[PDB]
Amino acid sequence: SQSIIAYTMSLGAENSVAYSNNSIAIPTNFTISVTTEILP
Amino acid sequence: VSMTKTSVDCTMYICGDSTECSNLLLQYGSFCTQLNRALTGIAVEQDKNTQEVFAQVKQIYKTPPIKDFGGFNFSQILPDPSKPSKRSFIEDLLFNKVTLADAGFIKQYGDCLGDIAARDLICAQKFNGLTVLPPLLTDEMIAQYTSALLAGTITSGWTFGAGAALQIPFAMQMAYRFNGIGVTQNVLYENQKLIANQFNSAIGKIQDSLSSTASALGKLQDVVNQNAQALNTLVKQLSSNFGAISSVLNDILSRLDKVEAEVQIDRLITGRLQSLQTYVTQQLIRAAEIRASANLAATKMSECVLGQSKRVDFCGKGYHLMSFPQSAPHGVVFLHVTYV
Amino acid sequence: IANQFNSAIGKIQDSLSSTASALGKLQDVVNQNAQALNTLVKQLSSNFGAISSVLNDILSRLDKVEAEVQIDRLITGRLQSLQTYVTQQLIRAAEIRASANLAATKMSECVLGQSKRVDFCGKGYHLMSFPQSAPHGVVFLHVTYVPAQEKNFTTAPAICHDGKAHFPREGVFVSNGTHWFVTQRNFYEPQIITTDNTFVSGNCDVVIGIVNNTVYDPLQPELDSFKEELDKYFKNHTSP
Amino acid sequence: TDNTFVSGNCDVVIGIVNNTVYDPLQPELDSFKEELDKYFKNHTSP
Numbered sequence: 001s002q003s004i005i006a007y008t009m010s011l012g013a014e015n016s017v018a019y020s021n022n023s024i025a026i027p028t029n030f031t032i033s034v035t036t037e038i039l040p
Numbered sequence: 041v042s043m044t045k046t047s048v049d050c051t052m053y054i055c056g057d058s059t060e061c062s063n064l065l066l067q068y069g070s071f072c073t074q075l076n077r078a079l080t081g082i083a084v085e086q087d088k089n090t091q092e093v094f095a096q097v098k099q100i101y102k103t104p105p106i107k108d109f110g111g112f113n114f115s116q117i118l119p120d121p122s123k124p125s126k127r128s129f130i131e132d133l134l135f136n137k138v139t140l141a142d143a144g145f146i147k148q149y150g151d152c153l154g155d156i157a158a159r160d161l162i163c164a165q166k167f168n169g170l171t172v173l174p175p176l177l178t179d180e181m182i183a184q185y186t187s188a189l190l191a192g193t194i195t196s197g198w199t200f201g202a203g204a205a206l207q208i209p210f211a212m213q214m215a216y217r218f219n220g221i222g223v224t225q226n227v228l229y230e231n232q233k234l235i236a237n238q239f240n241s242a243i244g245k246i247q248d249s250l251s252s253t254a255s256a257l258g259k260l261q262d263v264v265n266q267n268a269q270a271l272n273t274l275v276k277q278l279s280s281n282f283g284a285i286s287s288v289l290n291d292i293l294s295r296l297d298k299v300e301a302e303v304q305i306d307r308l309i310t311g312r313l314q315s316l317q318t319y320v321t322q323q324l325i326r327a328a329e330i331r332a333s334a335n336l337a338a339t340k341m342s343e344c345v346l347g348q349s350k351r352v353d354f355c356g357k358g359y360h361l362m363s364f365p366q367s368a369p370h371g372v373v374f375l376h377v378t379y380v
Numbered sequence: 381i382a383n384q385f386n387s388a389i390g391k392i393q394d395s396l397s398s399t400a401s402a403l404g405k406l407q408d409v410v411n412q413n414a415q416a417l418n419t420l421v422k423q424l425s426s427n428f429g430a431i432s433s434v435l436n437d438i439l440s441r442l443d444k445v446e447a448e449v450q451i452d453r454l455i456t457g458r459l460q461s462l463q464t465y466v467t468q469q470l471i472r473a474a475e476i477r478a479s480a481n482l483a484a485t486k487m488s489e490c491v492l493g494q495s496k497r498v499d500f501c502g503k504g505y506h507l508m509s510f511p512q513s514a515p516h517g518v519v520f521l522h523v524t525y526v527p528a529q530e531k532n533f534t535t536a537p538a539i540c541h542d543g544k545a546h547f548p549r550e551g552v553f554v555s556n557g558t559h560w561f562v563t564q565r566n567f568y569e570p571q572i573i574t575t576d577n578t579f580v581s582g583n584c585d586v587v588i589g590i591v592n593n594t595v596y597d598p599l600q601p602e603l604d605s606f607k608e609e610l611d612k613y614f615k616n617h618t619s620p
Numbered sequence: 621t622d623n624t625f626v627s628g629n630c631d632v633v634i635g636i637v638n639n640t641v642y643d644p645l646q647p648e649l650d651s652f653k654e655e656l657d658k659y660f661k662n663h664t665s666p
């Protein structure tokens with residue numbers, strides 16, 4: 001039941017930003033993340 | 041940011057439709073594969089360069105429908121929903137100042153033969169095995185990434201690069217941007233009408249300049265011109281003798297036998313093969329120039345658009361506030377806002 | 381913060397233990413240099429129009445005057461093979477020098493420093509990085525503060541208190557819905573709006589979107605408690 | 621005294637000039653000296 005499919009690629013999840021002339025979002029908490037980057 | 045993706049049918053370039061020449065060409069071995077592998081390595085990375093520059097958000101931010109940005113009028117650089125491709129007004133100027141040749145997008149002979157075979161250099165390139173492929177991202181997909189980066193920048197400031205997008209009022213973002221350049225944040229709030237009018241007037245001068253001059257995108261037209269001149273030079277190298285009785289492969293095989301032709305055809309293979317080697321050497325060297333430009337453009341995207349840059353004269357001449365990306369044919373355009 | 385770094389380093393081990401394609405940037409550079417030597421070796425098998433690809437089989441069959449017409453083909457084709465290889469390697473080497481110069485810039489600016497350059501040292505606000513060697517390369521373990529649990533707040537550019545307009549020294553103003561606070565921009569830690577948290581410039585009328593609140597002067601109850609110290613000393617000395 | 625910080629004395633800083641750094645606490649206490657003095661002048665009465 002597996003087959004090769006062809007599609008127009010998605011660019012990313014759509015997000016309307018909840019902007020208003022007096023609304024701010026501030027982080028009540030954080031994540032420390034470690035990301036590996038590999039260079040020749 | 042990128043350049044045209046050529047792929048060259050090395051046996052049809054050297055030996056167009058001939059068996060005798062294809063059986064002679066085999067005696068040079070790996071060369072036609074080495075050329076196609078090398079050109080595939082250039083064609084594969086034009087999509088790397090365009091992806092590294094534009095695909096710096098995995099989330100397509102959409103603007104609010106209401107434009108309460110505190111006087112700053114991005115309607116000139118934001119998408120126009122009325123258009124069949126949803127690019128902005130300044131992008132529709134940039135897309136007309138650079139005149140592309142063959143975006144890869146389908147040929148059906150009716151246009152490549154008859155009235156359109158004659159003048160059209162692109163059919164002469166194709167009929168000798170020289171083929172141009174389409175980019176992975178269409179001009180509509182590049183406009184959607186540019187739209188996400190801009191809709192992110194105006195609504196969210198730098199915060200959409202560092203993590204999840206956090207909304208902040210635009211005149212409140214500009215107060216952070218003023219503290220960035222060591223100016224106190226009240227110097228915005230006590231002058232906000234003036235700062236908005238100066239921004240709107242300065243974008244008015246971007247529209248006017250791009251609408252007026254014939255030469256502004258010269259850095260991009262000079263890439264289209266170099267690719268088109270290199271394919272035209274590669275086509276003209278088919279008209280040379282290299283010391284054979286004719287340049288034309290069928291004029292040898294319709295005049296000379298299975299042993300006089302081998303002495304002639306091997307000249308044309310030697311000179312044609314050196315012509316492909318010279319082309320792919322130039323195109324590999326060239327592709328390193330475009331790579332270096334794309335890695336710079338991805339850095340100006342990362343540091344001027346997703347951020348604010350304390351690096352002097354990196355993001356235009358002045359104290360950097362912010363930048364807006366705009367796409368162009370085979371490139372990117374930054375509108376760098378600066379306090380002077 | 382220590383538990384999150386220790387947990388995130390534990391995911392570096394698990395990722396490198398699990399997935400095949402991650403170090404693809406280094407393996408692709410081995411595979412190009414090996415494929416180029418293997419292509420250069422396979423090109424010795426080519427005739428280039430001589431009677432053999434094998435140089436000693438020409439010299440085993442032809443005399444000097446007939447052999448040099450064959451050997452010269454092989455010289456011409458094999459010297460074109462080396463010039464092609466050395467051209468490919470001279471072009472390639474500039475890809476690796478540009479990457480070595482980037483890795484040297486990431487060493488200086490991400491390892492020996494802290495980078496304010498956005499997304500240079502991984503997606504986040506850079507805290508630090510650690511170098512790790514890899515075959516023909518380097519791996520940087522970029523540590524970044526990423527903001528996580530954001531809640532929306534009402535905000536204002538300025539506060540009015542005394543006809544004067546007040547602005548954050550460092551931070552931004554926010555309201556929970558009933559009370560106004562000042563807070564640092566990158567972590568919600570709310571504080572009472574005071575004359576120590578805020579600087580003054582001009583009157584209310586010039587600021588777009590300014591709001592009314594009451595800015596605490598922490599000197600005032602420290603003097604008003606001194607007024608009750610003064611006034612009780614006054615009432616007592618009425619008595620004698 | 622809120623705009624500026626102090627360090628050492630005049631003899632070391634090449635090109636230092638004379639002026640008078642306002643202390644915004646000082647007249648807020650001198651007006652408290654008048655709030656003090658008026659109560660003493662009233663207390664001469666009873």
Ligand SMILES: *[C@@H]1O[C@H](CO)[C@@H](O[C@@H]2O[C@H](CO)[C@@H](O[C@H]3O[C@H](CO)[C@@H](O)[C@H](O)[C@@H]3O)[C@H](O)[C@H]2NC(C)=O)[C@H](O)[C@H]1NC(C)=O
Nearest residue numbers: 533534554555556557558559560561562570571572573596
């Ligand atoms: C906005 O934030 C305000 C500060 O956190 C908050 O007001 C505070 O509410 C608490 C109760 O949740 C009060 O706590 C005191 O309540 C009485 C006061 O007489 C005492 O019996 C208790 O022991 C306790 O000390 C705080 O006094 C009060 N703070 C202030 C400055 O009034 C608001 O409720 C928050 N509003 C929203 C919309 O969330």
Ligand SMILES: *[C@@H]1O[C@H](CO[C@@H]2O[C@@H](C)[C@@H](O)[C@@H](O)[C@@H]2O)[C@@H](O[C@@H]2O[C@H](CO)[C@@H](O)[C@H](O)[C@H]2NC(C)=O)[C@H](O)[C@H]1NC(C)=O
Nearest residue numbers: 016017018019020023024025104207529530531532533534
């Ligand atoms: C942050 O807020 C936006 C909208 O602002 C609030 O919207 C109301 C619901 C109310 O809380 C008001 O006091 C604020 O003005 C949120 O955007 C909403 O997202 C939902 C889906 O989650 C969507 O159905 C609504 O249409 C959106 N509303 C608007 C006006 O855009 C956003 O989700 C909030 N984010 C978080 C994490 O709570």
Ligand SMILES: *[C@@H]1O[C@H](CO)[C@@H](O[C@@H]2O[C@H](CO)[C@@H](O)[C@H](O)[C@H]2NC(C)=O)[C@H](O)[C@H]1NC(C)=O
Nearest residue numbers: 028029030031032381382383384385387528529
């Ligand atoms: C901030 O987020 C962290 C997670 O990164 C929270 O830590 C977790 O807290 C819950 C209980 O609330 C535990 O069940 C988890 O095991 C904790 N995780 C870790 C890594 O210790 C933290 O409590 C949050 N802090 C605040 C103030 O919201």
Ligand SMILES: *[C@@H]1O[C@H](CO)[C@@H](O[C@@H]2O[C@H](CO)[C@@H](O)[C@H](O)[C@H]2NC(C)=O)[C@H](O)[C@H]1NC(C)=O
Nearest residue numbers: 107108109111112113114115116129240244247
């Ligand atoms: C932002 O600027 C644009 C022009 O660049 C304004 O749009 C114009 O508005 C007038 C008046 O309604 C129309 O007659 C023009 O035809 C509009 N031009 C375009 C291209 O749409 C827009 O109104 C400005 N926004 C604000 C808030 O002032």
Ligand SMILES: *[C@@H]1O[C@H](CO)[C@@H](O[C@@H]2O[C@H](CO)[C@@H](O)[C@H](O)[C@H]2NC(C)=O)[C@H](O)[C@H]1NC(C)=O
Nearest residue numbers: 143144145146147148149150151152153156174
């Ligand atoms: C592929 O060929 C078909 C013809 O078979 C093209 O379809 C024609 O398109 C024109 C323009 O819209 C119409 O006027 C014709 O009547 C169509 N004919 C048919 C049979 O469909 C089609 O446009 C071609 N596609 C490409 C990409 O070249």
Ligand SMILES: *[C@@H]1O[C@H](CO)[C@@H](O[C@@H]2O[C@H](CO)[C@@H](O)[C@H](O)[C@H]2NC(C)=O)[C@H](O)[C@H]1NC(C)=O
Nearest residue numbers: 539540541542543544584585589590591592593
């Ligand atoms: C902030 O406070 C000021 C002063 O209390 C308000 O201004 C007053 O507005 C009323 C109604 O128009 C007038 O009758 C007063 O004479 C005004 N006084 C001053 C000093 O302006 C102002 O309206 C308040 N603003 C908000 C948003 O609440």
Ligand SMILES: *[C@@H]1O[C@H](CO)[C@@H](O[C@@H]2O[C@H](CO)[C@@H](O)[C@H](O)[C@H]2NC(C)=O)[C@H](O)[C@H]1NC(C)=O
Nearest residue numbers: 629630631632633634635636637638639640641
């Ligand atoms: C700044 O003020 C100080 C003090 O008023 C000056 O120093 C005085 O100079 C005079 C003249 O030489 C002496 O008679 C005083 O005894 C000095 N006072 C002290 C405390 O040393 C100083 O000259 C002034 N400098 C300038 C540039 O005006």
Ligand SMILES: *[C@@H]1O[C@H](CO)[C@@H](O)[C@H](O)[C@H]1NC(C)=O
Nearest residue numbers: 020021022108110588589590
């Ligand atoms: C903000 O926008 C609202 C409409 O959503 C409007 O009523 C208000 O006057 C605006 N205020 C400022 C300070 O721009």
Ligand SMILES: *[C@@H]1O[C@H](CO)[C@@H](O)[C@H](O)[C@H]1NC(C)=O
Nearest residue numbers: 612613615616617618619620
């Ligand atoms: C009043 O002042 C006298 C000093 O004259 C002191 O001894 C006494 O404790 C004071 N009492 C009060 C209630 O202040």
Ligand SMILES: *[C@@H]1O[C@H](CO)[C@@H](O)[C@H](O)[C@H]1NC(C)=O
Nearest residue numbers: 631632633634635636637638
């Ligand atoms: C500055 O230069 C003038 C001469 O133009 C000299 O008299 C004066 O003493 C100098 N002052 C300082 C602080 O160097």
Ligand SMILES: *[C@@H]1O[C@H](CO)[C@@H](O)[C@H](O)[C@H]1NC(C)=O
Nearest residue numbers: 658659660661662663665666
């Ligand atoms: C003095 O104090 C009395 C109360 O004991 C008060 O009524 C009066 O107004 C005060 N007068 C002055 C000059 O302080």
